[model samples]
Target: MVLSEFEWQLVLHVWAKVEADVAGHGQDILIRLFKSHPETLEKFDRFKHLKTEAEMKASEDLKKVGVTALTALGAILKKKGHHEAELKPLAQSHATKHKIPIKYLEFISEAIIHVLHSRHPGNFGACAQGAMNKALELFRKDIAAKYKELGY
Candidate 1:
């Protein structure tokens, strides 16, 4: 089901808190993800050498890709006209160039929510978290759908 107007507002409220530092927040999310799924790190040549949280933290290169990820998150949250079309390039890139297994997306989405709540537990109230959860699930499925279209 789609997010109701109330749910959308709640999710957006939490998003607004981190809107200013997308890359920094994104880095946190990625680090959390890699720690849990170390194998996923090798999918990107740039982050392949990150063996420790310290390494991941210090990598300027990691921050760049973090920006890409977080920016995409913002794009999906923004609900610009036809975000599915917007996500097509990312899906194609992951399916072809990144060669990332689609299974990793569940972990990636998990990391995002984890990082957001960990960063500001108080701001992420239960309603906001629940709302954001549904929103991200929808976003996750949309990208997966795009991947399916590309024969992934």
Candidate 2:
């Protein structure tokens, strides 16, 4: 919640790398999430029944959805605390229309941490990891609260 300037810079720097390869890295991240928690795949109509990693990677719907998700995540990372404009609507949409649970949103934070660590290798230290965790926790909490308020 209270990330220092250096922490902010660190997160932004790593996030830039993710933004650079949205489709490629984004698909990997989503695939990792599904692999780690297969039950979550039920939420994605496009991903539903697509058990194989190759099947997911080959799906045009998955590609488009993955890029869109990473793009929205990129927008939030770009501004951090001042992302209510995007987060509020996103929370509402997932909660109301998509019917995604807060738990899955929480899992997304973990997925992001995994992806950042795997993709960046030695770039993310304890400090950077802590910052990433806290930032995602805050964002997840806000989204969950908004979701509950939306009557979902």
Candidate 3:
């Protein structure tokens, strides 16, 4: 999906947030995520609490995959077309692996979008939808890999 300049701006702002407060804000974000998606606890070892800076840093490291994926998708979409074809297996693999219902996926994406818009007012736009799709793709892949390594 081609993003309006406004929406692309919002997504860029969100990526900036991840880059800026990655260790701290990423922890807070993960805290919020675990609270909302406790089922994911089965998929991660450090979900107990984003307690230490080191722990949170480790947590933040995991998010980089998604962040990078989102940025890549945004760049790709800006040049190509909506990434629907490339994103489905990413989503389906995640959904099937963790028993993550599409509802949960939708909810998380909505929350992330809201967080971005609220954090940077006037930036959220239609262009963000494709990034959201890419992010979901990243989310599933990360969780799938996490669960695999942890034997969860």
Candidate 1, which segments miss by more than 4 Å at Cα? none
Each model's TM-score, in the order given?
A: 0.91, 0.92, 0.47
Please write out the lDDT profile of model 2 over residues 12-71, one tens digit for every residue: 887877777888877887888898888889988766989899998898888888899988
* Shift in Å, residue 135, candidate 1: 1.2
lDDT for 130 in candidate 3 is 61
Models, CA RMSD each: 1.6, 1.4, 7.3
Q: TM-score of predicted model 2?
A: 0.92
Residue 106, candidate 1: alpha-carbon lDDT: 84
Better of 1 and 3 by lDDT: 1
Judged by lDDT, which candidate is best? 2
Please provide, for model 3 over 1-152, each residue's C-alpha lDDT reduced to its tens digit, 9 standing for 90 to 100: 24455654545555665556444433444445556776644555435445454664576554664455455444543433354455555545555554555456555665565555555565555666566555555544544554455454
lDDT (CA) for every model shown?
0.81, 0.82, 0.52
User: Between prediction 2 and prediction 3, which has the larger lDDT?
Assistant: 2
- Name the regions of candidate 3 deviating beyond 4 angstroms: 1-3, 43-81, 110-152
Two-way TM-score contest, 1 vs 3, winner: 1
Better of 2 and 3 by TM-score: 2
